[PDB]
Amino acid sequence: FEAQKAKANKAVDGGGGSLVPRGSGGGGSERHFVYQFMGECYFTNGTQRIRYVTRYIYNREEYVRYDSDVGEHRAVTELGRPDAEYWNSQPEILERTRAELDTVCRHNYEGPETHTSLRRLEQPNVVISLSRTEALNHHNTLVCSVTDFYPAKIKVRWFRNGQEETVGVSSTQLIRNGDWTFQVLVMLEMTPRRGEVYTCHVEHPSLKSPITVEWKA
Amino acid sequence: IEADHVGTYGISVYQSPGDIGQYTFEFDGDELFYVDLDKKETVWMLPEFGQLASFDPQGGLQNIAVVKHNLGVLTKRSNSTPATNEAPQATVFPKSPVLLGQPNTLICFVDNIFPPVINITWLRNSKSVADGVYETSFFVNRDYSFHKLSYLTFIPSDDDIYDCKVEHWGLEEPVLKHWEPE
Ligand SMILES: *[C@@H]1O[C@H](CO)[C@@H](O)[C@H](O)[C@H]1NC(C)=O
Ligand SMILES: *[C@@H]1O[C@H](CO)[C@@H](O)[C@H](O)[C@H]1NC(C)=O
Ligand SMILES: *[C@@H]1O[C@H](CO)[C@@H](O)[C@H](O)[C@H]1NC(C)=O
Numbered sequence A: 001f002e003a004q005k006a007k008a009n010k011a012v013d014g015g016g017g018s019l020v021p022r023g024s025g026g027g028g029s030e031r032h033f034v035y036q037f038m039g040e041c042y043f044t045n046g047t048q049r050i051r052y053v054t055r056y057i058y059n060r061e062e063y064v065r066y067d068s069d070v071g072e073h074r075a076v077t078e079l080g081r082p083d084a085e086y087w088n089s090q091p092e093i094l095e096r097t098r099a100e101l102d103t104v105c106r107h108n109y110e111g112p113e114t115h116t117s118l119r120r121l122e123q124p125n126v127v128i129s130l131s132r133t134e135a136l137n138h139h140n141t142l143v144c145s146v147t148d149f150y151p152a153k154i155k156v157r158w159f160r161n162g163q164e165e166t167v168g169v170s171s172t173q174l175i176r177n178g179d180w181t182f183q184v185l186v187m188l189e190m191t192p193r194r195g196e197v198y199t200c201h202v203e204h205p206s207l208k209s210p211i212t213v214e215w216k217a
Numbered sequence B: 001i002e003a004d005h006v007g008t009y010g011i012s013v014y015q016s017p018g019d020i021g022q023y024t025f026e027f028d029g030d031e032l033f034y035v036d037l038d039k040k041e042t043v044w045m046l047p048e049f050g051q052l053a054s055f056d057p058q059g060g061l062q063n064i065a066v067v068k069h070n071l072g073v074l075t076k077r078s079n080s081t082p083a084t085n086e087a088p089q090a091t092v093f094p095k096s097p098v099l100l101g102q103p104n105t106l107i108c109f110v111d112n113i114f115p116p117v118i119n120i121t122w123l124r125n126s127k128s129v130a131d132g133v134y135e136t137s138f139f140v141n142r143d144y145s146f147h148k149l150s151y152l153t154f155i156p157s158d159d160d161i162y163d164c165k166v167e168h169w170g171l172e173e174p175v176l177k178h179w180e181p182e
Helices: A077-090 A090-095 A105-115 B048-050 B057-077
Strands: A036-042 A051-058 A061-065 A071-074 A125-131 A143-150 A155-160 A162-163 A169-171 A182-189 A198-203 A211-215 B006-013 B020-027 B030-036 B041-044 B089-092 B104-113 B118-124 B131-134 B146-154 B161-167 B177-178
Touching: A036 B057, A051 A077, A051 B030, A061 A077, A071 A077, A071 A090, A077 A090, A077 B057, A090 A211, A105 B006, A125 A211, A143 A155, A155 B104, A162 B057, A169 B118, B006 B057, B020 B057, B030 B048, B030 B057, B089 B177, B104 B118, B104 B161, B118 B146, B146 B161
Parallel strands: none
Antiparallel strands: A036 A051, A036 B006, A051 A061, A061 A071, A125 A143, A143 A182, A155 A162, A155 A198, A169 A182, A198 A211, B006 B020, B020 B030, B030 B041, B089 B104, B104 B146, B118 B161, B131 B146, B161 B177
């Protein structure tokens, strides 16, 4: 499936208007300039409610925009007015953009995105360990690592040779790794006793059944 | 805002001083691919993905031109106001749990980068090591700043140590994020 690209409209002439002072900055930099365009379009409940928003950012300020619930370009800041008006006047420009909600968004979801992103199921690796310095004193931690998984929805739980325990339980946040996989760490403040069997319950990403790992006696 | 899945596409970034460009497609915080502007080719991060979907590289080159144009303008249209530098963060952490001798990847997460001109160098006991090293495209943040990732393919041993080196015009001097299995 070929993905469609969001197009950026050219900025009108742009004579070079002198924007009166604002609230700049400094104390350690040089002279640099950054431009940014992005065709972000929000999906919700399948492809039933999409919302397309193209934003153009100067330096670090959105100066011009196009909202799907508006139906046209609206200047987010004065230096946008030039662009917002011209682009809203050319059917060649404004009707093409107005069309990206389907050509550059519904298209991609239903095409590439479904046969790609939406079908990404990477099962989580799980193993428990022993941390927290030395033994009985106030230090005796059990860590259950849940790694290399995707999608992000996941549920992890501890178990003391029987029931679910919640006290002394701490789990990191999502923790993205950048390569389309997540990993989350779950600690457990405890004390090992003869016969005690702790287990770590993980579930979802790609497990048709909740997996479990035991840490014997 | 309010939405299950979010598809970020045609992300086009360009910097005046340096003719610096980046063209990317993102999905739920993850990079679908980036277009090498030099080689002029779509590079997917997930090769499996590349085998099921495709993208015409000229589209990206095509957008940079626009972005490139549009910049000069705003530049002009703005009495030439420069962008203000920022101080980036840094978090290192292993892809998977540390297990001596067994291959692992050290991750160096940098957020709040701006402008998108940063230097990230891996330090093994103070020895600027370069190889088995990988880096990601700049990621978009809400406040329009960015965050990038670097990866160090290494072998863990309870002796040597490491240090992710970050340099940015926003920091008086290189920030050192230290990580070690001990
Ligand atoms: C344009 O830039 C010059 C140089 O910074 C500045 O002195 C001047 O105030 C700006 N134009 C205006 C609004 O006077
Ligand atoms: C909308 O449908 C999607 C199906 O992909 C589902 O995940 C979601 O829960 C539904 N709406 C909500 C948020 O309840
Ligand atoms: C990054 O590396 C280049 C290579 O010479 C150097 O010119 C530049 O000053 C460095 N910037 C920083 C401090 O990150």
